[PDB]
Amino acid sequence: DITVYNGQHKEAAQAVADAFTRATGIKVKLNSAKGDQLAGQIKEEGSRSPADVFYSEQIPALATLSAANLLEPLPASTINETRGKGVPVAAKKDWVALSGRSRVVVYDTRKLSEKDLEKSVLNYATPKWKNRIGYVPTSGAFLEQIVAIVKLKGEAAALKWLKGLKEYGKPYAKNSVALQAVENGEVDAALINNYYWHAFAREKGVQNVHTRLNFVRHRDPGALVTYSGAAVLKSSQNKDEAKKFVAFLAGKEGQRALTAVRAEYPLNPHVVSTFNLEPIAKLEAPQVSATTVSEKEHATRLLEQAGMK
């Protein structure tokens, strides 16, 4: 039996864990919390840490641990399960990427068609969308977007987008508040994450939902995909069944269990989600490097500059 530090969504983590027990008989305990907190906890603990595996919703947390030398190198077959152009790759072969979640624009089909949408997310911060586009300034995904824009187009383009959103866009407390705002007819469109809509639609019945998703693609900053991954800790006393859990995660069975309940893009190519998600390669997501500590501070100072926080 193993212990998994889970920075991933609980019903997701839980569904993949139960599937693992049914196939191997290996029980799984889950210590849930967010990646960066759990990563630090593992740092403090060290050699006598209870963690066998680290299931993170983000790549940065895995990097810090990898840099501290705390991660166990995985067998080649585990890593190749999700290998592909654009998919994050571990330098010390000590962690593997598993899934992705994209940024999108949700619009009101009662008033808009794909014809009326922009070809780049940078184009929404203009007078043509004054009071017609919504965003969530306190969202951790919104900041990730800021960080990618700076890496892809420079600092100047990032502050121009933000100040332009402040002057014409409309802020919303959460991503849920923003989605239900477009669904209510209070605002034309809004910048959010893909799974929010996919979940709402599955719950309500798509024939009753008036909102739809738009993907810019073409390596635009707005086509940004964020990845999930997993690793085994060198300090583990159950390493072989810890390696099995990571291989199950990267493999077909694991991928199918996760995509039966979670609307994230499967990195394993032999998997068909139960949600209407095209193959990840088709989103034409831009290639961006992992988010560092200084990079978050920079985007944080830029939101202050723009006056959104």
Automatic annotation (TrEMBL):
Kindly indicate whether the keyword Nucleotidyltransferase belongs to this entry: no
One GO MF term: metal ion binding
Q: Which PROSITE patterns match?
A: SBP_BACTERIAL_1
Cellular compartments per GO CC: outer membrane-bounded periplasmic space
Task: Supply the alphabetized keyword list.
Answer: Ion transport, Iron, Iron transport, Metal-binding, Signal, Transport
Q: Name one GO biological process term.
A: transmembrane transport
Give any Pfam family that matches. SBP_bac_1
| Annotated family | Belongs to the bacterial solute-binding protein 1 family.
The name this protein goes by in its record: ABC transporter periplasmic binding protein
> Taxonomic lineage per UniProt?
Bacteria, Pseudomonadati, Pseudomonadota, Betaproteobacteria, Neisseriales
